[PDB]
Amino acid sequence: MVLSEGEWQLVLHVWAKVEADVAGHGQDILIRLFKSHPETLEKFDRFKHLKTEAEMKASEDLKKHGVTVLTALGAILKKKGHHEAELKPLAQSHATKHKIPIKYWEFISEAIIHVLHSRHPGNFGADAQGAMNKALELFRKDIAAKYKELGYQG
Numbered sequence: 319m320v321l322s323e324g325e326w327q328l329v330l331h332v333w334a335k336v337e338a339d340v341a342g343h344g345q346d347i348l349i350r351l352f353k354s355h356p357e358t359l360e361k362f363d364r365f366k367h368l369k370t371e372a373e374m375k376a377s378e379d380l381k382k383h384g385v386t387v388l389t390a391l392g393a394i395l396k397k398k399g400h401h402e403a404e405l406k407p408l409a410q411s412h413a414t415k416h417k418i419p420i421k422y423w424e425f426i427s428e429a430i431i432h433v434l435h436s437r438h439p440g441n442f443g444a445d446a447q448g449a450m451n452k453a454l455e456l457f458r459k460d461i462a463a464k465y466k467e468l469g470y471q472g
């Protein structure tokens with residue numbers, strides 16, 4: 319797939335607001351993911367023990383990881399489709415070190431959109447949301463193709 323420049327512009331406009339508070343958004347997103355789909359929490363040996371939202375909010379380690387997650391994602395979105403090199407080490411660790419099924423990538427995609435919609439309704443209308451969804455689909459399908467090449471696909 320190919321996004322048009324207009325769709326990229328809606329994606330990076332919203333993303334510019336996210337970057338005003340990278341730590342805050344990464345924590346909201348990860349927490350939303352773990353509440354909505356608790357099974358994903360089990361893949362993180364580091365966070366496995368957190369039992370409540372309050373424990374998650376309080377974890378400095380979790381907020382650090384969220385900053386790490388959104389920074390890697392930001393650098394990919396800013397490539398506007400040209401993200402081959404950024405993608406490979408990411409797919410390799412998640413496929414063969416962390417053992418992450420493809421399905422969980424959709425789950426975090428869902429969380430991202432929920433959070434942007436709650437925090438940026440003015441900059442996250444129907445059109446901007448369709449653009450963000452297209453960008454994350456594009457991303458997921460490229461991750462899925464790399465999984466396959468790496469011998470995982472699952």
Ligand code: HEM
Nearest residue numbers: 358361362364386387390391407408411416418422423426
């Ligand atoms: C937008 C999607 C995501 C991005 C950009 C992302 C990025 C990263 C980065 C940059 C790291 C650290 C270096 C590495 O191991 O490659 C990491 C580690 C990790 N990721 Fe992801 N991640 C994403 C989605 C996921 C998903 C869907 C899961 C699990 C449901 C996941 C599980 C993990 C685990 C288990 C670690 C290691 C945590 C630790 O340090 O103990 N990631 N992620």
